[PDB]
Amino acid sequence: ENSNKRLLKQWEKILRDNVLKLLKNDNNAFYFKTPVLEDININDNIKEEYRIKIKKPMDYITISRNLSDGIYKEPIDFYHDMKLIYKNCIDFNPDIEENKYIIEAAKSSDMKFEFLWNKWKEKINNNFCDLN
Amino acid sequence: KRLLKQWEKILRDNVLKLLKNDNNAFYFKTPVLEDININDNIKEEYRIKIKKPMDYITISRNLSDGIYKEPIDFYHDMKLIYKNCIDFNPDIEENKYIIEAAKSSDMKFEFLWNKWKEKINNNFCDL
């Protein structure tokens, strides 16, 4: 919520505006916006199951916060976290009719993210100095 | 029933199948000009403006009947559905869901095309 005066690096700006911005508010974003373990809409029994089973829970708001705070040391650390959101959904939720929308939303967003990462990886690598 | 070519089966089962029944497929399933939910005023303007209307059921029929001679013809028609949606619908708050659904599915299709293209080109005889 607090205003961040920290100046984002050019590679961090590309991930924020050209990759994350187009995914964080799309038609398949709804279930991946806020964290699972602190969401009031999910019952306590599923939240207990998620905390015990999921190694690292990930969502769009955590990524927006990490990108703002300068948590990622390399652009690939953002890639791994974005991929983690969709990978956690497929691994936790069983492939059944009641989970049809959520499994499709995770699969489609992963494909959409991979396109956006492939389209921008050239400029991302060019704006990132690994030697400094 | 006509026996489909191996490359046609790859486009049907590995590309089209994952797109025709997704969360953004709704508006791109059946043709605009024959859809009962759309009013005649939008329909006539679509007939005048849009050069070639395209949808998932038209592509499913074209792939099964053997309309496409090359796999790139399926690619051009698949892109056309999302292209016609952006060109006709103005960038307004009312058309927010539809414009996003065309953009996201275009990105999804491009992923599935690039993923399978190596197997698609191999299963197609050029000469």
Domain boundaries, chain B: 1-127
A94 backbone φψ class: left, alpha, beta (φ>0; ψ -120 to 50)? beta
Closest alpha carbon within chain A to B101:
A27
Q: Nearest CA to CA, how far is B111 from chain A (Å)?
A: 6
Q: What are phi and psi of B34, to 5 degrees?
A: -115, 5
Q: Which residue of A has its CA nearest to B110?
A: A115
Q: Which chain A residues touch B96 with a CB distance below 8 Å?
A: none
The experimental method is X-ray
Q: Are A112 and A15 in contact (CB under 8 A)?
A: no
Chain A interface includes B111 (CB < 8 A): yes
Q: Which residues of A touch B108 (CB under 8 A)?
A: 108, 111-112, 115
- The answer to whether the CB of A128 falls within 8 A of the CB of A74 is yes
> Are residues B111 and A116, on separate chains, in Cβ contact within 8 Å?
no
Distance set, CA A48 to CA A42, A52, A91, A130, B69 (Å) = 11, 6, 16, 40, 55
- Just give the CATH number of B1-127: 1.20.920.10
Residue B5 and residue B2: Cα distance in Å, rounded? 10
User: Residues 14-53, chain B: which have Cβ within 8 Å of A?
Assistant: 18, 22-24
The whole-angstrom separation of Cα B123 and Cα B127 is: 13
Beta carbons of B107 and A111 less than 8 Å apart: yes
Q: B22, B25, B108, B16: which is closest to A102 by C-alpha?
A: B22
Give the resolution in Å. 2.5
Nearest Cα neighbor of B122 from B3, B5, B1, B4 is B5
Task: Say if A106 is an interface residue toward chain B (CB within 8 Å).
Answer: no
Beta-carbon pairs below 8 A across chains A and B: 37
- Locate the chain A residue with the closest alpha carbon to B97: A27
The three-point CA angle B5-B11-B16 to 5° equals 140
Three-state secondary structure of A49-108: HHHHHCCCCCCHHHHHHHHHHCCCCCHHHHHHHHHHHHHHHHHHCCCCHHHHHHHHHHHH
Q: Do B24 and A111 touch (CB under 8 A)?
A: no
Phi-psi region of B66 (alpha: psi -120 to 50; beta: other; left: phi over 0): left
Q: Is B113 on the interface with A (CB under 8 A)?
A: no
Assign domain A1-132 one CATH number from 1.20.920.10, 3.10.129.10, 3.30.830.10, 2.40.30.10.
1.20.920.10
Which residue, among A24, A102, A115, A117, would best test binding to B if mutated, counting the most B CBs under 10 Å from its CB?
Answer: A115
Is A91 in contact with A57 (CB distance < 8 Å)? no
Token pair listed for B102: 């065309």
